Symmetry: D2
Subunit: 123 residues, 4 copies
């Protein structure tokens, strides 16, 4: 039983990365898709996780993902332009909590995630 | 600020895939890694999500990921061989719930996830 | 709110006190005061109490949308301890209303405006 | 174990610790009327609290002090009056700063009732 490799961030644009606020855009391509021809769940999550890490960095911190929860609201499609917005909603000494949401070019919600990040040091 | 693309399943072996139980192994490679040289969180999640889909298919169903929660317990390292075990723990009328575990070659727990899948149909 | 007497039944299991400040179209605001029965052995609002607050308000969001539904999954982050006599504001909002699923965000903040806890509920819609 | 028993009797009308050894805990309880919602099903908060407290017990059995940082729960099948629930907690990761517990609740017919994961922040030894 064969299935294709899943790649994330073969293209992206960082529109914003400042003080706990991150906006990144990307276009869904063939390497983003699952066997059903929709944006893979792992692809969408990876978008959110990377943007969460980007938020961490924008706070001048180094950290690792400790825990995450994600809801998939609307399918992502080939050639969709996805906007990934990440923001810190709580900054603690050892943990941070980030909200990350993805919307498509028509402004429709694709997925929504919450990340608990473990602070591992200071940039 | 530049960062590399993250790839998943550039290599894998399906050891088991039958009746709601799936076992897949894979090797952590350079495309698996984040900027710190550890297995990317999205990579690990993708391993879990894909094996969850594999569980759905092994039950003779087609489905979509509705919700997922994941805990990252121990870092995945370059050249680690990861074993991904997924099993259905509840089959509802339109939804299924999968437990997925990733352990390394040393038998240490790497991460643990729960997936709520939406059943979209019945396979042929 | 005789129209939601079921809530008022379950609420007297989860609140020794509460006030609904807002309840309209997927947006709910409820306040409550932390009491002794809310506390664990160490004097903090125990996780089950806070979770139950969020769950109850999530049910309220569902009702405010005119729906019947069942919780499939829930996630909660604990940010700051709740203390005796704290006044907690529990805000619920629908972030996705589908015909088959709903997703609710519930946030709890204290009288000082600090984040107490943050939760998400994944619900299966069962009716009107 | 004064803290666990205060919290357990303050939240539950009955419980039994059947097993408690080194990150593995088993507790049973019988669903009573106070456990039920207006429609006669076990409250989501009741089930969650069962899981959270058993998670705290797992922490204790490891000889640690900690606080719940994050939790996820999946509701699989409704709990009913007179059901006997078996709540099993297992540590799947004991870290220096965090612990992760897997908690499963099954009923007397062996059916999965709910499944939860708890992320605990370790605050000390105990
Ligand atoms: C799971 C899901 C179908 C639930 O549907 P919902 O809560 O009712 O939301 P909506 O009412 O807005 O419906 C959205 C789409 O799903 C369809 N749909 C809704 N309920 C459905 C159901 N019970 N059965 C089959 N299709 C359904 C709708 O017809 C609609 O189709 P459209 O794209 O042509 O408009 C929806 O949330 C979803 O598609 N999430 C994205 C899943 C995903 O991308 N996972 C990652 C890849 S596996
Ligand atoms: C999140 C995490 C660091 C929590 O730490 P923990 O519960 O104490 O677990 P451990 O005791 O086994 O420690 C693991 C590492 O984290 C370090 N660490 C633990 N607590 C720390 C703390 N308060 N501050 C800084 N570092 C800490 C440890 O020193 C150790 O580092 P090392 O392997 O280089 O020696 C750990 O669970 C983990 O590494 N999870 C996987 C993270 C991941 O892979 N995310 C996806 C990629 S971003």
């Amino acid at each position: 039983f064969h299935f294709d490799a899943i790649s994330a961030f073969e293209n992206y644009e960082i529109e914003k990365m400042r003080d706990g606020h991150v906006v990144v855009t990307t276009k869904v391509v063939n390497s983003s898709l699952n066997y059903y021809g929709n944006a893979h769940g792992g692809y969408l999550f990876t978008l959110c996780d990377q943007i969460s890490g980007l938020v961490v960095i924008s706070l001048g911190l180094d950290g690792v993902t400790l825990q995450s929860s994600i809801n998939y609201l609307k399918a992502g499609k080939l050639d969709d332009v996805l906007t990934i917005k990440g923001e810190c909603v709580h900054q603690g000494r050892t943990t941070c909590v980030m909200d990350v949401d993805i919307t498509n070019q028509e402004g429709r919600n694709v997925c929504k995630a919450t990340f608990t990040m473990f602070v591992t040091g200071q940039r």
